Design a protein around this ligand. Structure first.
Ligand SMILES: CCCCCCCCCCCCCCCCCC(=O)OC[C@H](COP(=O)([O-])OCC(O)COP(=O)([O-])OC[C@@H](COC(=O)CCCCCCCCCCCCCCCCC)OC(=O)CCCCCCCCCCCCCCCCC)OC(=O)CCCCCCCCCCCCCCCCC
Ligand SMILES: CCCCCCCCCCCCCCCCCC(=O)OC[C@H](COP(=O)([O-])OCC(O)COP(=O)([O-])OC[C@@H](COC(=O)CCCCCCCCCCCCCCCCC)OC(=O)CCCCCCCCCCCCCCCCC)OC(=O)CCCCCCCCCCCCCCCCC
Ligand SMILES: CCCCCCCCCCCCCCCCCC(=O)OC[C@H](COP(=O)([O-])OCC(O)COP(=O)([O-])OC[C@@H](COC(=O)CCCCCCCCCCCCCCCCC)OC(=O)CCCCCCCCCCCCCCCCC)OC(=O)CCCCCCCCCCCCCCCCC
Ligand SMILES: CCCCCCCCCCCCCCCCCC(=O)OC[C@H](COP(=O)([O-])OCC[N+](C)(C)C)OC(=O)CCCCCCCCCCCCCCCCC
Ligand SMILES: CCCCCCCCCCCCCCCCCC(=O)OC[C@H](COP(=O)([O-])OCC[N+](C)(C)C)OC(=O)CCCCCCCCCCCCCCCCC
Ligand SMILES: CCCCCCCCCCCCCCCCCC(=O)OC[C@H](COP(=O)([O-])OCC[N+](C)(C)C)OC(=O)CCCCCCCCCCCCCCCCC
Ligand SMILES: CCCCCCCCCCCCCCCCCC(=O)OC[C@H](COP(=O)([O-])OCC[N+](C)(C)C)OC(=O)CCCCCCCCCCCCCCCCC
Ligand SMILES: COC1=C(OC)C(=O)C(C/C=C(/C)CC/C=C(\C)CC/C=C(\C)CC/C=C(\C)CC/C=C(\C)CC/C=C(\C)CC/C=C(/C)CCC=C(C)C)=C(C)C1=O
Ligand SMILES: CCCCCCCCCCCCCCCCCC(=O)OC[C@H](COP(=O)(O)OCCN)OC(=O)CCCCCCCCCCCCCCCCC
Lengths: 98, 153, 247, 173, 122, 126, 193, 251
């Protein structure tokens, strides 16, 4: 049976964005792990603080580093997906309006 | 594609209504906007309005880029003219005119300016083109060239 | 479709000797301040030999161009079973004739500068030393002839600047788009990404079959569809015959 | 990530990348009668972009060639005095930089739309490139397979009942 | 009637031999094209041996040249055979170049005659 | 505090730059292009910014010799680099397989090689 | 390209001639082939390239792609083998001459740890063995993906039970059908219209 | 670093954010442009009370924080327990929050009079919209049938600006010309929804027999939020405020 067909242009753009975003996500996860390790090493060696505070700071530093690395692909995919979802919703509403 | 139903020829009352609509559109046409009476007059005016909106956005972005890139790129870039690559401070190197530059740092300041101003303008226009959106007046399939008559509006 | 585009990969190798000559001339000019006539005879003779080589190449090309206009062919008279030589005129696109005239002018100019160089070398040999006026005059003659050597590359300029001419006026409302500067700033980014991907991302391999003959003469079939040029039926038949002969 | 991702002439990092030389070669083995009006419009837009892009490529390559020519001349910057040698030697250096740039493929939304379209026009262009331009199609198919595009024309098709017509380069399964 | 572009494969020796034999002995070709190929062959056969003979003579002279003669045999023979190698390779290269250029012109004529080029018509 | 970063200019952006001491602290023992050009720049700046006539004229005399020496060094550099570039170009084109499989449609003019109009070109006469 | 009635089904003939218990028989019955995904599996499969090529040649002889692959692989084997032999000969000659003159490259230990073999002998052994291993590895990497794709196509054909000769198959002259060159145009008749 | 610079210096960061964010989010979710606007209005009205209460509590704390210190005369617990003072401040903030929430979200029923409708004296518009939505909202508990899907696909090019000229080709439509014209008029010209056709309803009942046996009612018509939400109140026959409108509703 026939079914709603999405726009090929949007499909291709989303495919490219998704590939880039997956590659980023992976590399950025590794970068975040490395940044957490480095922040923990620095805190335990040069910073006079409690272990809980040092660990929290290291976790936040790693998360921030990963987000900085992966923001470009995440933002690009977010905007492309938002546009595609808006277009699909408008088309489906126009089709099913009664 | 499919064809719509063709209405029967208009009556005199319909003709009068169309004439009144065309008169109203002509009156609404701005005085300072010079567009010739043609089938594409309304399409051209809409295109011009969209282009004016894009122009406004582009010039705002260009002004913002001139404001921002200055302290960030051009001014630090001018720190490279403090000394030559040999380590000696900047001194004038004439080409054919041995201009007298007795004024303090005249040579260094002018040499830095000659490269900073073009760099400033280039970076500002790059910022404008990067952060300005042309979506409003972009037509990939050129479907906005359809003629719109004054009475239809 | 007659665009007349010549390959730059072929043009650069042909252009090499002239730039070599001009660079050697500049080096001789610069070194004349602290060098003697006997030592610089090496550079003078190298320049002379390079100029002779370029003169031979120019003469060969000029001879080919001038001999084009004489159309000589062999016609087989079957009644006498004899081949006979026949001469006829030529018909071709006038652009070819115009560029032939331009190349004739280039050849005459190169002969002139070659005679100039011969005169200069003979005079310096007689005098016993080189002089800046004549040396620099010869160097600038070499530079000018190098500039003129690009005469037959006008098709690229036409190919670039005819698509700008064919663009209609913006307000005639044919397409309502102007993307010059936009395309410039977008192509900056596109080239940046392309270069980064080329030198850091996946690059498809260039390996190919180098031994099997006529391997890449792909005849039409279900895999390649049948949307080829209509008269490629003969090409497909010839490919089939060649494959049969190979096997 | 510029603010004009909608623009057809624009491109993305992971979009299909095609060289200018490859595009001009592909233009040779195509017929307009066999393309739908939408495909013809796509090709016309692509030419509209390429008209400016090709002319701008040497502009992009100019600074690199200028620097290379200066380095070849030496470590002395003599301004107008050295223009003759700079531009006589740069007349061959800049062509090399333009050669590298043109051989470098660049992504483009129009390129990906034309090549990877799942319609009759896409199939026609892919088959024509496969048949009349095997050398270009080999690289194009390698790129598509690496970017997770599946078509019957690809040499890397693992679900095909017919043998490939070209050498299959090594890749990860 | 073959792929065009930088990524394509240059003509192979076997392909050139097959094409020239086809032009020589095929029925679909025209008498003028066949005559062109035959003239190419006959007029190119000379250089292959002319270059070899010139190289032999030059190498015979260079063996007894002022310095080569006094050089030891290991250096003498190697240095004296260089002109022969250069002339022989030049002769073979020019023979092949002339023959292949004229055969390719004949192939172009055949393609135009049979209308096998997608962008050529009257 | 936006003014403290926008309207406040660094002292180096206004006051004349000094001499980069690290550039001369340690130098090679070779009278090479680097040392020659360093001395040339030093003398040139001193001539530009000094009011002492006795030292400038001798500085001019020394600077002429420095210019000659730098010209010699540049000549050597130009020779070496140009020869290397030419040899590399020649070797690249010797070992590079030049594509000899380009389209030859341009060289063919079917309507011109065999005159399509035949005898109608000469006068007509119909 | 070959019409069904013009197809000689040489692949089907070979399949019939094959034995009862065969991997091709199992594939025809419906056994599915999946390329190894682990490093150990790929390393094991690296040595099966020759057998796969031989069986594919036996099945689809006269196939254009298979014939081209065979020719290219044979030429590559010859070229790599001769290059390796030349490299080994040159290295051995150089080592012998320099050892005669008293110069030995300071590579490898002077004496063996277990048998006390001399550095010269071990250098000869390495020069002989290493290039052969490198040649084998290079050829296997070059041809592994191509061989796997060809084998996957063959297995898919067997599973679908398509034993007819594939596309781009050119039989010899004996099996090539003659072309009828006798054509008699129909008698001309004035159109009634 | 180029992307980081872009993020920092994007002009959108300086540009003030608008109210279109909710509409865009709802459109991406699936609501139509009008439905998105109505839902965004409802959500904004619901949250405005809380935002205003928080702002009022903050302003009250800022202006009259000394009241907590003054109260120590009667409640020395504030003086001798700063934690108690902090809890009292939090309680005051929550009190303002709840007052605002009551003002903007509580039913606060009032008369439907044009003289005071929309003045916020009563939360009539919000109350009526919420009641209508909650009462008439019933998710479609079916699966769209093949006929409905085909009609939705066929509705790609339909437009009410100009009626389509339907042409009967026997070789692709079958049946008779009159029957085909009647069916086409029913499907498209009449505007009748696909689920309102008798055979479509029968197929729906046959396919959902299990739900019917379990006792669950099948909703033929999917919920239309724009048919029950109207920020202006015209749908619910709420009289517009006189001084901001130049027309009257009968009621
Ligand atoms: C040197 C020292 C340093 C100081 C100086 C700075 C450096 C030197 C250059 C400065 C002067 C540049 C020219 C004037 C531009 C501004 C004019 C103006 O203010 O009037 C309003 C006028 C109209 O503005 P608008 O209608 O609002 O358009 C903006 C909208 O956003 C819409 O945007 P859009 O993208 O749609 O573009 C709009 C435009 C787009 O139009 C086009 O498409 C034209 C360009 C097409 C592409 C290029 C083709 C030609 C080059 C081919 C190269 C081939 C190479 C060879 C290849 C093969 C061989 C290797 O079309 C129009 O709007 C219609 C008018 C087109 C006029 C174009 C001709 C302008 C020059 C002539 C008049 C002025 C006198 C100039 C004197 C000489 C200056 C050197 O401005 C424009 O021309 C458009 C905006 C241009 C960008 C901003 C420029 C800011 C100024 C600083 C720029 C610094 C340099 C970096 C950028 C490169 C130059 C642009
Ligand atoms: C597929 C087979 C291919 C065969 C190709 C042909 C060449 C290899 C086989 C040749 C055999 C006949 C040679 C002539 C014999 C003449 C008589 C004689 O005196 O011998 C000459 C001479 C020994 O005489 P020598 O005077 O005593 O000299 C001793 C010097 O230390 C030796 O010093 P060196 O100057 O020779 O230098 C040390 C040696 C490097 O030797 C090492 O010590 C490197 C060790 C690397 C270990 C890496 C991790 C291994 C992890 C476990 C793997 C398990 C097996 C996995 C199998 C996977 C599927 C294939 O070479 C180098 O470092 C330079 C070459 C660069 C490395 C390339 C090596 C490629 C080997 C390919 C064949 C491998 C066959 C494995 C068989 C199964 C083994 C279980 O033999 C050789 O030079 C051939 C050595 C072959 C490899 C020996 C490996 C021993 C360590 C095994 C560890 C694992 C098992 C431990 C078991 C413990 C008890 C339960
Ligand atoms: C935020 C949104 C912004 C939107 C955009 C706005 C843009 C700006 C546009 C502004 C345009 C102006 C709008 C003004 C609206 C005013 C309200 C309105 O429309 O009412 C019309 C009002 C309609 O009210 P209604 O008839 O009750 O109908 C029900 C309502 O429709 C609806 O009733 P309901 O269902 O809601 O509730 C039923 C009932 C339920 O409620 C009750 O029962 C409440 C009962 C107590 C009253 C309210 C609390 C009072 C608390 C004590 C006082 C304040 C304490 C704090 C301060 C200290 C004070 C000492 O309420 C009533 O009984 C309503 C009676 C009206 C008075 C109470 C209304 C609240 C007054 C708030 C005053 C403070 C706010 C500022 C001033 C007003 C706004 C400008 O029309 C009249 O009643 C006028 C009829 C006139 C007939 C002709 C008279 C001829 C003259 C005869 C006497 C001559 C005397 C001469 C003396 C000479 C002596 C020498
Ligand atoms: C007297 C005046 C004479 C003027 C004649 C010279 C005009 C030069 C015009 C240059 C235009 C270049 C357009 C290139 C378009 C390429 C399109 C394409 O697909 O790319 C594949 C290109 C062309 O490849 P191809 O030519 O092998 O393509 C094969 C296909 N056919 C057969 C159709 C040609 O790839 C290359 O090989 C790279 C070529 C780059 C050439 C760039 C030259 C730019 C100009 C440099 C001048 C320097 C002078 C010094 C001073 C400079 C400052 C002023
Ligand atoms: C072998 C060792 C013993 C000692 C050898 C001594 C070297 C002898 C060099 C002789 C040089 C002759 C110069 C002829 C100039 C005229 C050329 C001409 O008109 O072209 C005709 C023919 C060309 O005719 P053509 O028309 O077939 O051109 C072919 C064109 N291409 C290359 C595109 C296929 O010349 C040649 O074949 C080559 C000419 C090269 C010219 C180079 C000039 C500068 C360098 C000269 C050599 C310097 C060597 C110094 C010693 C080095 C020792 C290590
Ligand atoms: C078929 C092929 C072509 C056939 C035609 C034959 C063409 C023959 C061309 C010969 C050219 C010879 C040029 C010699 C120049 C000598 C200059 C001189 O006197 O030295 C001044 C001086 C010589 O200086 P000096 O360096 O010798 O010494 C100066 C004195 N000291 C050193 C003490 C300070 O040079 C200069 O001033 C430098 C610039 C020279 C510019 C020369 C321009 C010549 C223009 C010639 C035009 C010819 C037109 C021909 C028309 C067609 C004819 C058919
Ligand atoms: C143990 C020995 C210690 C020795 C001392 C020296 C130690 C040096 C350690 C270096 C660690 C480097 C870690 C890099 C982590 C990158 C994370 C990441 O993805 O970020 C990408 C981002 C950019 O992201 P993006 O989105 O633009 O793109 C990232 C790349 N792609 C596009 C592929 C996704 O880069 C950063 O902003 C990183 C830096 C963050 C801020 C901290 C900077 C600290 C150093 C500042 C020095 C300034 C000196 C003065 C400069 C003056 C200039 C005029
Ligand atoms: C795809 O990516 C993108 C694009 O495409 C590429 C874009 O176009 C754009 C468009 C927008 C843009 C703003 C363009 C961005 C362009 C960029 C970043 C490139 C241009 C960058 C520049 C011009 C900056 C160059 C300047 C510098 C590096 C600063 C140099 C400073 C130096 C050398 C300092 C030297 C000073 C000293 C040593 C101090 C000396 C002091 C002394 C006292 C002297 C010594 C004295 C004594 C006594 C010792 C975007 C946003 C983008 O993301
Ligand atoms: C979450 C669980 C964990 C525990 C936390 C529980 C939180 C409960 C809810 C919020 C409670 C808020 C009150 C907190 C304690 C009291 C804070 C306070 O001191 O506020 C009064 C203070 C008066 O100012 P004062 O410094 O005394 O100046 C006198 C000048 N003569 O004025 C102020 O300093 C202003 C206080 C404002 C309080 C919030 C009001 C709501 C709106 C806030 C808008 C955003 C404010 C951002 C402030 C950023 C500051 C860096």
């Amino acid at each position: 049976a026939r079914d709603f067909e999405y726009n090929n242009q949007d499909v291709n753009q989303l495919n490219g964005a998704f590939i880039s975003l997956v590659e980023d996500e992976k590399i950025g996860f590794w970068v975040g792990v490395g940044g957490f390790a480095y922040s923990q090493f620095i805190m335990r060696k040069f910073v006079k603080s409690t272990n809980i505070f040092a660990s929290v700071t290291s976790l936040f530093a790693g998360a921030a580093l990963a987000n900085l690395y992966t923001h470009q692909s995440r933002a690009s995919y977010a905007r492309v997906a938002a546009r595609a979802n808006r277009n699909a919703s408008l088309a489906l509403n126009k089709l099913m309006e009664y | 594609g499919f064809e719509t139903v063709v209405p029967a020829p208009p009556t005199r009352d319909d003709e009068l209504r169309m004439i009144k609509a065309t008169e109203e559109q002509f009156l609404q046409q701005p005085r300072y906007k010079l567009y010739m009476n043609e089938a594409h007059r309304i399409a051209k005016m809409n295109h011009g309005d969209r282009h004016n909106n894009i122009r406004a956005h582009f010039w705002s972005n260009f002004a913002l880029g001139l404001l921002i890139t200055g302290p960030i790129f051009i001014i630090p870039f001018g720190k490279a003219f403090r000394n030559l690559r040999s380590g000696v401070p900047y001194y004038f190197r004439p080409k054919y005119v041995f201009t007298q530059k007795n004024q303090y740092n005249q040579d260094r300041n002018w040499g830095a300016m000659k490269k900073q101003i073009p760099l400033w303008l280039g970076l500002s226009t790059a910022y404008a083109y990067w952060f300005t959106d042309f979506s409003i007046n972009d037509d990939e399939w050129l479907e906005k060239g359809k003629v719109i008559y004054p009475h239809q509006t | 479709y007659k665009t007349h585009l010549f390959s730059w990969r072929w043009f650069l190798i042909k252009l090499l000797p002239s730039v070599s000559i001009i660079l050697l001339g500049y080096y001789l000019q610069l070194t004349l301040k602290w060098n003697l006539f006997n030592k610089q005879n090496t550079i003078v003779l190298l320049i002379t030999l390079l100029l002779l080589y370029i003169l031979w190449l120019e003469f060969y090309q000029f001879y080919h161009i001038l001999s084009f206009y004489g159309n000589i062919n062999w016609a087989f008279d079957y009644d006498e079973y004899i081949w006979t030589l026949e001469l006829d005129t030529r018909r071709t696109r006038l652009a070819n004739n115009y560029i032939a005239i331009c190349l004739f002018a280039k050849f005459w100019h190169f002969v002139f500068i070659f005679l100039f160089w011969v005169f200069f070398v003979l005079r310096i040999n007689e005098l016993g030393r080189i002089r800046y006026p004549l040396l620099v005059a010869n160097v600038q003659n070499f530079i000018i002839i190098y500039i003129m050597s690009w005469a037959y590359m006008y098709p690229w300029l036409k190919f670039i600047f005819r698509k700008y001419l064919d663009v209609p006026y913006y307000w005639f409302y044919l397409n309502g788009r102007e993307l010059g500067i936009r395309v410039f700033f977008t192509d900056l980014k596109l080239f940046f990404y392309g270069i980064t991907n080329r030198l850091f991302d996946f690059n498809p391999s260039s390996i190919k079959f180098e031994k099997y003959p006529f391997y890449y003469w792909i005849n039409s079939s279900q895999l390649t569809e049948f949307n080829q040029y209509r008269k490629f039926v003969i090409r497909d038949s010839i490919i089939y015959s060649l494959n049969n002969y190979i096997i | 990530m510029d603010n004009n991702y909608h623009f057809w002439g624009n491109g993305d990092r992971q979009d299909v990348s095609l060289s200018y030389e490859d595009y001009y070669s592909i233009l040779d083995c195509l017929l307009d009668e066999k393309l739908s009006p939408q495909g013809l419009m796509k090709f016309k837009n692509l030419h509209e972009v390429s008209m400016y892009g090709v002319s701008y490529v040497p502009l992009y390559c100019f600074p690199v060639a200028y620097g290379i020519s200066h380095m070849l001349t030496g470590k002395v910057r003599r301004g107008h005095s050295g223009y003759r040698n700079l531009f006589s030697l740069m007349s061959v250096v800049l062509p090399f930089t333009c050669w590298y740039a043109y051989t470098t493929p660049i992504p483009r939304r129009l390129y990906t739309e034309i090549i990877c379209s799942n319609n009759a026009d896409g199939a026609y262009v892919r088959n024509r490139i496969k048949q009349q331009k095997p050398g270009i199609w080999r690289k194009l198919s390698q790129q598509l397979y690496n970017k997770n595009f599946r078509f019957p024309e690809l040499n890397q098709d693992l679900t095909a009942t017919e043998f490939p017509l070209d050498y299959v380069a090594p890749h990860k399964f | 009637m073959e792929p065009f572009g930088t990524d394509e494969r240059n003509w192979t020796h076997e392909e050139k031999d097959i094409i020239t034999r086809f032009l020589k002995y095929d029925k679909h070709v025209n008498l003028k094209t066949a005559e062109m190929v035959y003239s190419a062959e006959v007029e190119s056969a000379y250089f292959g041996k002319a270059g070899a003979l010139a190289g032999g003579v030059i190498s015979a002279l260079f063996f007894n040249f002022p310095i080569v003669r006094n050089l030891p045999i290991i250096r003498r023979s190697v240095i004296g055979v260089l002109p022969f190698l250069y002339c022989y390779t030049w002769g073979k290269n020019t023979q092949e170049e002339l023959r292949w250029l004229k055969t390719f012109a004949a192939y172009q004529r055949f393609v135009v005659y049979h209308g096998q080029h997608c962008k050529l018509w009257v | 505090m936006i003014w403290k970063y926008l309207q406040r200019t660094n002292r180096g952006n206004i006051i004349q730059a000094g001499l980069q001491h690290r550039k001369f602290e340690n130098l090679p023992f070779k009278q090479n292009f680097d040392n020659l050009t360093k001395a040339y720049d030093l003398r040139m700046w001193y001539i530009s910014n000094s009011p002492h006539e006795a030292k400038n004229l001798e500085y001019v005399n020394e600077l002429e010799a420095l210019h000659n020496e730098l010209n010699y060094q540049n000549s050597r550099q130009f020779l070496f680099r140009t020869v290397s570039f030419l040899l590399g170009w020649a070797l690249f084109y010797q070992f590079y397989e030049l594509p000899k499989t380009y389209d030859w449609q341009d060289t063919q003019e079917p309507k011109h090689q065999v005159p399509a109009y035949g005898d109608l070109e000469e006068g007509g006469d119909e | 390209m070959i019409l069904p009635h013009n197809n000689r089904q040489l692949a089907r003939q070979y399949f019939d001639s094959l034995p009862e218990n065969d991997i091709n028989r199992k594939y025809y019955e419906g056994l599915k082939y999946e390329t190894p995904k682990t490093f150990f599996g790929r390393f094991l499969n690296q040595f099966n390239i020759d057998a796969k090529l031989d069986t594919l040649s036996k099945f689809y002889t006269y196939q254009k792609t298979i014939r081209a692959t065979q020719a290219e692989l044979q030429e590559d084997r010859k070229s790599y083998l001769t290059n390796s032999l030349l490299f080994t000969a040159v290295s051995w000659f150089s080592i012998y001459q320099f050892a005669r003159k008293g110069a030995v490259l300071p590579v490898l230990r002077e004496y063996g740890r277990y048998f006390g073999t001399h550095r010269l002998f071990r250098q000869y052994l390495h020069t002989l063995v290493l290039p052969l291993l490198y040649t084998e590895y290079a050829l296997n990497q070059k041809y592994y993906t191509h061989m796997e794709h060809l084998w996957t196509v063959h297995v898919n054909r067997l599973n679908q039970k398509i034993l007819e000769d594939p596309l781009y198959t050119f039989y010899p002259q004996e099996l090539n059908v003659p072309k009828h060159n006798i054509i008699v145009p129909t008698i001309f008749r004035d159109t009634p219209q | 670093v180029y992307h980081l610079f872009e993020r920092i210096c994007n002009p959108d960061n300086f540009k003030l954010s608008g109210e279109a964010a909710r509409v865009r989010t709802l459109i991406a979710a699936g609501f139509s442009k009008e439905e998105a606007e109505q839902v965004a209005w409802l959500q904004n009205h619901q949250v405005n009370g809380k935002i205003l209460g928080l702002f009022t509590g903050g302003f009250a704390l800022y202006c009259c924080n000394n009241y907590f210190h003054y109260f120590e005369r009667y409640f020395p617990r504030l003086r001798y327990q700063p934690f108690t003072k902090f809890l009292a401040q939090a309680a005051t903030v929550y009190f303002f929050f709840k007052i605002g929430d009551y003002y903007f979200t509580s039913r606060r029923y009032g008369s439907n009079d044009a003289r005071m409708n929309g003045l916020m004296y009563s939360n009539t518009y919000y109350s009526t919209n919420k009641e209508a939505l909650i009462q008439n909202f019933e998710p479609l508990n079916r699966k769209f049938t093949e006929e409905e899907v085909e009609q939705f696909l066929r509705n790609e090019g339909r437009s009410q600006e100009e009626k389509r000229n339907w042409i009967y080709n026997p070789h692709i439509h079958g049946s008779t010309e009159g029957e085909w014209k009647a069916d086409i008029h029913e499907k498209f010209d009449s505007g009748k929804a696909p689920w309102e056709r008798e055979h479509v309803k029968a197929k729906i009942l046959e396919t959902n027999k299990a739900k019917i046996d379990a006792g669950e009612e099948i909703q033929l018509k999917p919920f239309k939020t724009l048919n029950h939400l109207d920020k202006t109140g015209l749908l619910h026959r709420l009289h517009p405020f006189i001084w901001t409108n130049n027309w009257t509703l009968l009621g």
